[PDB]
Every structure is written in C-alpha cells, then in structure tokens.
Amino acid sequence: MLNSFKLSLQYILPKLWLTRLAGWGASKRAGWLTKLVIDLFVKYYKVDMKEAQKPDTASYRTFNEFFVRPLRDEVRPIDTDPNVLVMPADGVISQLGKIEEDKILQAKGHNYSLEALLAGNYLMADLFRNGTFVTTYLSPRDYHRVHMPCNGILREMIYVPGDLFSVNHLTAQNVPNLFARNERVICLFDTEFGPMAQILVGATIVGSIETVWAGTITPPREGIIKRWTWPAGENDGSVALLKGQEMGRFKLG
Amino acid sequence: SFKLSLQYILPKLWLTRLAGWGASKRAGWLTKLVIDLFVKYYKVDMKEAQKPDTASYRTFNEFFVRPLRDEVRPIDTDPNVLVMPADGVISQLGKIEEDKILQAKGHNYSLEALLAGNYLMADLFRNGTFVTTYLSPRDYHRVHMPCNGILREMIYVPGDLFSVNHLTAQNVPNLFARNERVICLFDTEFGPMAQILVGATIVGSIETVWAGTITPPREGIIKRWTWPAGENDGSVALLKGQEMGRFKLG
Amino acid sequence: XTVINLFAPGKVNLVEQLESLSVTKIGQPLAVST
Amino acid sequence: XTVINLFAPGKVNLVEQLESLSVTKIGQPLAVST
Ligand SMILES: CCCCCCCCCCCCO[C@@H]1O[C@H](CO)[C@@H](O[C@H]2O[C@H](CO)[C@@H](O)[C@H](O)[C@H]2O)[C@H](O)[C@H]1O
Ligand code: NA
Ligand code: NA
C-alpha cells in the first residue's frame, strides 16, 4: 500500500458535494467577485487570453462562461489531408498506442479493461479490441470544448455514472480503473476509418459534460446508465458532424 | 424528510466499511454482546437457527449469515412450483410493463437501468414478471434458488448504498437501479430467470456459492462472468431451494 | 437487503394471494408454470 | 478533463512523434488512415 496523504484525500474528500458547490459558484453572476476569481485563475494557471474570442476577463458574466470560452477560429486551423484525423482537444497526451487485446494503458505499467471503460458493453468492446487509443488530459488553463477528429455519423451515446476522482500522475499511477470508474459520456460514430469512440471523462470539480446534440448530460446525476441511439447516415433522424467541429465540452458542477 | 436528506449527506460507504471491519472481528465477549443486543432490539428468532447459542458465533457476520435448521424451511415438492428465494416481505411484484418495474405507488424504474444498460438481457424480460423481496435485519440473510437453474451469466454492478425502506422506496428515484448489486441469470425449465441481490447501507457485502464474496472489494467497474449450457465442463447447476448466495455487513 | 427475480413473458403465474407486504419464507410457493 | 479516443484494429496509425506529455492542439495531426 502507498501511504500518501494526497492519495487518501481522493478517498476521504466529499468529491461530489465539492463539485456541486463549485458548480453553484461557477454559475453565479457575481460581478467584481466573478472577475476577481477569473483573474486569480488566469494568473495562477497561466491562461492565454489572446487565443480567446473575448480576451477581456470582464466580458464573462459567470466563471463557467469563462471556463467554456470560445477561441478565435484562426488559432486552431484544421489539417486539410482527409486521411488525417486531428486532435479533438487542447492539452497533453496522457497515454496512447495499441489496445493490447482488452488492455489500455492508464500509466507506465498500469492497464485497465476496454470493456470496463465501456461500462461492460462487450459488443462495443468487440469493435475496438486490438485497436488504437489516445487519452488527452485537458488542464485548467486549456480550452474546455472538444471537437471532432474526423467526419462522423453519431450512432450511440452512453451516460455512465461514476466517481469524480482527480486526474493527475498520482491518481493515474495509484487509482485502479481511474477512467473506467469516473463519470463519463461515451460517443460512438461511424467514420471513413471505421467505428470511432470519443469518451468525455469527468473529474473532481470539472464534473459537468455537454454534447452539441443533447446539451448538458450531467448534472443532474440520476445514478443510472442511459443509452441513446441514432440511425445510419443515409436515414432520417441521423446526426452528422464534420472534422474539427465542436461536439461537446466540460464545465464546473 | 430530515431522514431522507441524511440518505444524501451520510458517508454510506465509509459507515458500511466500518460495520464490515467490526462484524469481521473475532471479539469474544464484545461480539456476543453486540449479537445479543441485535437479537433483543430486532426480535430475532434463534429457535430457527442450527446453533441457537449466540456464544457459538466467533464474528457478528457469522451470526448475520447464520444457517437455519432444514426442518423449518420445507421446500415445496411440485416441480411446476417456483418457491420464495428469501425470508422477508414482498416489496412489489407483478407485470413488467414493457421496460417499467414498480418501485412504489407512482414510481417506476427501467428494466434496462436495473440491468446496467444490458439491452440484450432486458430483451429477455420485457413484458415479463418481477418480484422484489425485502430482507429485514431480523430475517435469515442467505438467498436460495426459486427453481432448478443452470447459471449462465453474473454481472457485478457498482453503485450507491442507499437504505431500503418505505421512505426511500417512495422517495429515492431509481433506488434498485442505482444501488450496488449482483445480477445472476439462469437457464430454467420456465425460461430465462434473473435473481438480483441488491445491497444497502451497512448490509453491503454480497456472496454467491460459486464465487464467494463478490463485494467487497469495490473496484468501481462492471464485471461480467459467463458459464456454459448445462451438462458441459465448467457448468454450474443449482437445485430448487438450494443456497445460491447471501448478504453480510461490509 | 433486496432480492429481485425476473421471469420471461408468459412463463409463470405469481400465486394470487401475494401482494405488497406479504410475508415470504424460503421454500413456500412464489409462482407456477403456465 | 479527459478525452479518450478508440479506433478499430488496422484502421489508423498514430503520428509517430506523439508520446506521453506531447502538447495537443485542436486541428493538429493525431493519426493517419492505413
Ligand atoms: C469557482 C467558482 C467561483 C466563482 C466566483 C463567484 C462565486 C461567489 C458566489 C457569491 C454569490 C453572488 O450572488 C450574486 O449576487 C449578485 C448581486 O450583484 C446578483 O446579481 C443579479 O441578480 C440580482 C437579484 O438576484 C439582481 O438584483 C442583479 O441586478 C443581477 O445582476 C446575482 O444574480 C447573484 O447570483
Ligand atoms: Na461565477
Ligand atoms: Na448532481
């Protein structure tokens, strides 16, 4: 057993109540106090406001409005090779590479189950066994909207209740099944490159997840798995998104 | 209403682990004292137990899962009769109305949600029949087969540890679909059958006779096991009224 | 705790006397084949 | 936070320069069709 005060807090702290408290505060129009918290955040996390459509911190009525701020289009050019899939999110690669049968790397030496990440959906896991994975970590300073790696027809979305562990080197190394046990939304697309999943995983504080087709998925937190399906692209009622288009976002609460 | 608010405030999982730690201790006189207080307050009938002597239990959990004398639970002998799997009271029973199961007057929950989004398993039971049995602290806490069954699938589902009582049954949405539970799916002469063991605050530990203790530990993921059809190598078969699992503290 | 049983459509009839708060005992009749 | 992508076997090659802690920016190359 690792004897680590910081790790033990992950298991002791009322992570859900702290996330709800932060969501309450982040939704408030608090004028000078909103601007103060945003300025402290911008300073401490070294946010680059020059990439934002509205670089002025006074232009945000709520902390959440600031957290989900849009970027100027010019600053994220979408690669034009149609054979190229692009990064869906600003931040850093956590881990990437081969799915070794059912195994995805969480940290050097630490694996978790593809089937567990997909909430026990063995039919969906069958699509990705021996495939490829990319895990991108978005930090507090990064843009918090998520865009498409390629053209996609949405086929399935799954809301998975779970925990709100923090994501950092300590939890990646010491919390088993970190990404398979945290509240998440699974999105499954038909693409030119075959089936593709884009999974948005919550963390402490940053526990609210949206998609562009369904709005805010969480909160509220009703404690059950929810499944939506859409038809193939040639059919009425289909949802299609283009490479580099916004598909969802994270915010506080 | 104060009591309802506590369901959402109380550290249900830490209280469950505290109770599990205490209930697993071979604590001699203190084990026997807690057992005697419990027996007194909940009006337990020790005459039905194989060992009516409360000193014969080395741990509170040994007492909680105490076996009954066979004589006191005669198993119906009509092979066309399915029997009660547990001592307690019916919570609700009847028709699964498409995907809908009744939790309490005016509250439904989803068959697919109870089965953790397993739509292929939900398809077996749409428009079928359900029975929900509540086991109280005073009841026997092992669970027995309603009929002969070949075990085909078991699913461990992480979840909450809400208390189960009239107040939470009436007021907590999705109570049974959000609590930690084990789903057991059987081949029977009466078609597919599910027996689902749902945990609650304190009484959070679930065992089967084929797997031992499923929970704890609580590793936060869905786990699925499968078994072959009957009369194959690796097959697990249980008879009507045979023990298939139990609940204990922790 | 709680035990939930599910049966496939048209396979069993619940013994008609059982309702909310009926006492259950292991080995007593719950349902009959159709 | 975290975004996880899964791709089917034989379908994409990850850009070879990317590793743990590589900076990601929306629109930049992630993978190439096989
Ligand atoms: C990480 C999260 C931290 C984010 C920073 C801010 C959190 C602080 C929480 C303190 C609560 C502030 O509460 C906020 O007060 C101002 C008063 O100017 C209100 O101001 C607004 O509503 C009031 C009435 O409700 C109107 O009279 C007012 O004209 C209107 O602009 C906000 O509607 C209220 O939401
Ligand atoms: Na705010
Ligand atoms: Na919530």
PDB file of N, CA, C and O and ligand atoms in Angstrom, chain A residues 21-31 33-35 37-38 62-63 205 252, ligand 1:
ATOM      1  N   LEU A  21     -20.861  22.284  -5.154  1.00  0.00           N
ATOM      2  CA  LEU A  21     -20.563  23.630  -4.591  1.00  0.00           C
ATOM      3  C   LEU A  21     -19.866  24.488  -5.642  1.00  0.00           C
ATOM      4  O   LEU A  21     -20.193  25.694  -5.771  1.00  0.00           O
ATOM      5  N   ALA A  22     -18.886  23.928  -6.346  1.00  0.00           N
ATOM      6  CA  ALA A  22     -18.140  24.653  -7.385  1.00  0.00           C
ATOM      7  C   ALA A  22     -19.095  25.004  -8.537  1.00  0.00           C
ATOM      8  O   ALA A  22     -18.936  26.085  -9.112  1.00  0.00           O
ATOM      9  N   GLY A  23     -20.023  24.124  -8.878  1.00  0.00           N
ATOM     10  CA  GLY A  23     -20.960  24.364  -9.993  1.00  0.00           C
ATOM     11  C   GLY A  23     -21.909  25.509  -9.643  1.00  0.00           C
ATOM     12  O   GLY A  23     -22.190  26.352 -10.505  1.00  0.00           O
ATOM     13  N   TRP A  24     -22.366  25.540  -8.398  1.00  0.00           N
ATOM     14  CA  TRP A  24     -23.216  26.629  -7.853  1.00  0.00           C
ATOM     15  C   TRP A  24     -22.465  27.951  -8.003  1.00  0.00           C
ATOM     16  O   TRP A  24     -22.972  28.864  -8.672  1.00  0.00           O
ATOM     17  N   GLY A  25     -21.249  28.049  -7.457  1.00  0.00           N
ATOM     18  CA  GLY A  25     -20.436  29.274  -7.532  1.00  0.00           C
ATOM     19  C   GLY A  25     -20.127  29.666  -8.954  1.00  0.00           C
ATOM     20  O   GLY A  25     -20.149  30.875  -9.251  1.00  0.00           O
ATOM     21  N   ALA A  26     -19.826  28.701  -9.825  1.00  0.00           N
ATOM     22  CA  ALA A  26     -19.385  28.998 -11.202  1.00  0.00           C
ATOM     23  C   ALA A  26     -20.571  29.499 -12.031  1.00  0.00           C
ATOM     24  O   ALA A  26     -20.339  30.034 -13.092  1.00  0.00           O
ATOM     25  N   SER A  27     -21.797  29.229 -11.610  1.00  0.00           N
ATOM     26  CA  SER A  27     -23.000  29.643 -12.379  1.00  0.00           C
ATOM     27  C   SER A  27     -23.495  31.048 -11.958  1.00  0.00           C
ATOM     28  O   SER A  27     -24.406  31.597 -12.618  1.00  0.00           O
ATOM     29  N   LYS A  28     -22.903  31.630 -10.919  1.00  0.00           N
ATOM     30  CA  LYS A  28     -23.380  32.902 -10.297  1.00  0.00           C
ATOM     31  C   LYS A  28     -22.856  34.099 -11.094  1.00  0.00           C
ATOM     32  O   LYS A  28     -21.683  34.122 -11.506  1.00  0.00           O
ATOM     33  N   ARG A  29     -23.710  35.090 -11.335  1.00  0.00           N
ATOM     34  CA  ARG A  29     -23.310  36.416 -11.868  1.00  0.00           C
ATOM     35  C   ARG A  29     -22.864  37.270 -10.680  1.00  0.00           C
ATOM     36  O   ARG A  29     -23.742  37.908 -10.060  1.00  0.00           O
ATOM     37  N   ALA A  30     -21.574  37.253 -10.324  1.00  0.00           N
ATOM     38  CA  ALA A  30     -21.099  37.898  -9.075  1.00  0.00           C
ATOM     39  C   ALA A  30     -20.242  39.127  -9.388  1.00  0.00           C
ATOM     40  O   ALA A  30     -19.486  39.514  -8.513  1.00  0.00           O
ATOM     41  N   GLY A  31     -20.353  39.697 -10.587  1.00  0.00           N
ATOM     42  CA  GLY A  31     -19.707  40.969 -10.974  1.00  0.00           C
ATOM     43  C   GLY A  31     -18.226  41.003 -10.616  1.00  0.00           C
ATOM     44  O   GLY A  31     -17.452  40.226 -11.239  1.00  0.00           O
ATOM     45  N   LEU A  33     -16.522  40.028  -7.997  1.00  0.00           N
ATOM     46  CA  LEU A  33     -16.078  38.737  -7.393  1.00  0.00           C
ATOM     47  C   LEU A  33     -15.877  37.657  -8.474  1.00  0.00           C
ATOM     48  O   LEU A  33     -14.897  36.893  -8.348  1.00  0.00           O
ATOM     49  N   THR A  34     -16.759  37.596  -9.487  1.00  0.00           N
ATOM     50  CA  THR A  34     -16.594  36.749 -10.700  1.00  0.00           C
ATOM     51  C   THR A  34     -15.277  37.143 -11.364  1.00  0.00           C
ATOM     52  O   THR A  34     -14.432  36.243 -11.632  1.00  0.00           O
ATOM     53  N   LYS A  35     -15.095  38.436 -11.624  1.00  0.00           N
ATOM     54  CA  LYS A  35     -13.895  38.939 -12.347  1.00  0.00           C
ATOM     55  C   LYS A  35     -12.642  38.631 -11.509  1.00  0.00           C
ATOM     56  O   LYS A  35     -11.636  38.230 -12.088  1.00  0.00           O
ATOM     57  N   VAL A  37     -12.059  36.143  -9.219  1.00  0.00           N
ATOM     58  CA  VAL A  37     -11.777  34.677  -9.292  1.00  0.00           C
ATOM     59  C   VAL A  37     -11.207  34.339 -10.671  1.00  0.00           C
ATOM     60  O   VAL A  37     -10.178  33.658 -10.725  1.00  0.00           O
ATOM     61  N   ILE A  38     -11.802  34.849 -11.744  1.00  0.00           N
ATOM     62  CA  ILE A  38     -11.290  34.615 -13.122  1.00  0.00           C
ATOM     63  C   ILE A  38      -9.852  35.132 -13.232  1.00  0.00           C
ATOM     64  O   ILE A  38      -9.049  34.455 -13.905  1.00  0.00           O
ATOM     65  N   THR A  62     -20.153  34.890 -15.779  1.00  0.00           N
ATOM     66  CA  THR A  62     -20.054  33.756 -14.817  1.00  0.00           C
ATOM     67  C   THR A  62     -18.686  33.088 -14.989  1.00  0.00           C
ATOM     68  O   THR A  62     -18.131  33.164 -16.081  1.00  0.00           O
ATOM     69  N   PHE A  63     -18.143  32.496 -13.933  1.00  0.00           N
ATOM     70  CA  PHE A  63     -16.891  31.714 -14.060  1.00  0.00           C
ATOM     71  C   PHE A  63     -17.058  30.605 -15.128  1.00  0.00           C
ATOM     72  O   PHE A  63     -16.161  30.457 -15.970  1.00  0.00           O
ATOM     73  N   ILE A 205     -14.650  18.552  -9.486  1.00  0.00           N
ATOM     74  CA  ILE A 205     -14.904  19.993  -9.772  1.00  0.00           C
ATOM     75  C   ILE A 205     -15.395  20.143 -11.212  1.00  0.00           C
ATOM     76  O   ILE A 205     -16.521  20.683 -11.416  1.00  0.00           O
ATOM     77  N   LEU A 252     -17.720  23.330 -14.706  1.00  0.00           N
ATOM     78  CA  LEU A 252     -17.755  23.029 -13.264  1.00  0.00           C
ATOM     79  C   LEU A 252     -19.175  22.634 -12.909  1.00  0.00           C
ATOM     80  O   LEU A 252     -20.076  23.274 -13.477  1.00  0.00           O
TER      81      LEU A 252
HETATM   82  C1  LIG E   1     -15.165  28.510  -8.797  1.00  0.00           C
HETATM   83  C2  LIG E   1     -16.465  29.259  -8.625  1.00  0.00           C
HETATM   84  C3  LIG E   1     -16.242  30.685  -8.090  1.00  0.00           C
HETATM   85  C4  LIG E   1     -16.926  31.765  -8.940  1.00  0.00           C
HETATM   86  C5  LIG E   1     -16.882  33.214  -8.403  1.00  0.00           C
HETATM   87  C6  LIG E   1     -18.186  33.726  -7.791  1.00  0.00           C
HETATM   88  C7  LIG E   1     -18.749  32.879  -6.629  1.00  0.00           C
HETATM   89  C8  LIG E   1     -19.349  33.721  -5.485  1.00  0.00           C
HETATM   90  C9  LIG E   1     -20.773  33.359  -5.047  1.00  0.00           C
HETATM   91  C10 LIG E   1     -21.457  34.549  -4.323  1.00  0.00           C
HETATM   92  C11 LIG E   1     -22.931  34.813  -4.686  1.00  0.00           C
HETATM   93  C12 LIG E   1     -23.161  36.007  -5.640  1.00  0.00           C
HETATM   94  O1  LIG E   1     -24.565  36.189  -5.926  1.00  0.00           O
HETATM   95  C13 LIG E   1     -24.926  37.107  -6.984  1.00  0.00           C
HETATM   96  O2  LIG E   1     -25.101  38.449  -6.469  1.00  0.00           O
HETATM   97  C14 LIG E   1     -25.459  39.413  -7.475  1.00  0.00           C
HETATM   98  C15 LIG E   1     -25.600  40.775  -6.807  1.00  0.00           C
HETATM   99  O3  LIG E   1     -24.815  41.683  -7.581  1.00  0.00           O
HETATM  100  C16 LIG E   1     -26.730  39.047  -8.295  1.00  0.00           C
HETATM  101  O4  LIG E   1     -26.963  39.985  -9.389  1.00  0.00           O
HETATM  102  C17 LIG E   1     -28.064  39.684 -10.293  1.00  0.00           C
HETATM  103  O5  LIG E   1     -29.256  39.226  -9.615  1.00  0.00           O
HETATM  104  C18 LIG E   1     -29.812  40.158  -8.661  1.00  0.00           C
HETATM  105  C19 LIG E   1     -31.010  39.553  -7.930  1.00  0.00           C
HETATM  106  O6  LIG E   1     -30.780  38.182  -7.578  1.00  0.00           O
HETATM  107  C20 LIG E   1     -30.179  41.469  -9.363  1.00  0.00           C
HETATM  108  O7  LIG E   1     -30.692  42.410  -8.403  1.00  0.00           O
HETATM  109  C21 LIG E   1     -28.940  41.992 -10.101  1.00  0.00           C
HETATM  110  O8  LIG E   1     -29.213  43.205 -10.803  1.00  0.00           O
HETATM  111  C22 LIG E   1     -28.478  40.915 -11.082  1.00  0.00           C
HETATM  112  O9  LIG E   1     -27.394  41.330 -11.913  1.00  0.00           O
HETATM  113  C23 LIG E   1     -26.641  37.612  -8.845  1.00  0.00           C
HETATM  114  O10 LIG E   1     -27.852  37.157  -9.504  1.00  0.00           O
HETATM  115  C24 LIG E   1     -26.226  36.655  -7.722  1.00  0.00           C
HETATM  116  O11 LIG E   1     -26.102  35.400  -8.383  1.00  0.00           O
END
